[PDB]
């Protein structure tokens, strides 16, 4: 169950911080991934919300890019 | 009135003749603070046009995604470990502007449009920002 498509940081809005958290989770999973040690690590719900590109394949760089495209009106929605 | 902003953009000032192209380099003073991302749209006084937005944000050595149709650009400015970056003094944005050969003498502004978001971290928190300059003097008004 997704609460809001693109809302990787679970704050109830879709903005560029959602692309940031995805990139951070991928770049330093021990700090920022689903079981990370930082207080602002991505959450399980965030990984579901963030899987906007090729939904079903989980979180990759392309999910962050899709959020950027949406924010730029290059695509009309997420997913 | 707005308080002293956390981050200050400078669009520069320019002088051009009608018909010329102008490279507008936008720099940023974050007062030594790190920035995780930006998501912005630009604006320019008619009849000048922003023809293209560079896909490099040199201040962060990162690639920007663009959409000229909305004069938009965004990026994530993180190191290879995911940590937000402090910008250098290099341009954060470069805009390629055309001054049509029909443009009347005058001073024409370039700046942000209705959206300029400078993010601090990964949680939707944002710095306050402001922009200075962006005056393009065309001819001798
Ligand atoms: Ca969000
Ligand atoms: Ca995905
Ligand atoms: Ca100003």
Numbering used by the authors:
A (entry chain B): 24 to 102
B (entry chain A): 3 to 143
Authors' own words:
Cellulosomes are sophisticated multi-enzymatic nanomachines produced by anaerobes to effectively deconstruct plant structural carbohydrates. R. flavefaciens Docs have been organized into six groups based on primary structure homology. The data revealed that group 1 Docs display a conserved mechanism of Coh recognition involving a single-binding mode.
In those studies, highly stable complexes were formed between RfCohScaB3 and a group 1a Doc, RfDoc1a, and between RfCohScaA and a group 1b Doc, RfDoc1b. RfCohScaA-Doc1b is virtually identical to RfCohScaB3-Doc1a and includes residues 3–143 from RfCohScaA and residues 24–102 from RfDoc1b. The two Docs are less conserved at the C-terminus of helix-1 and this generates differences in the interaction with the Coh.
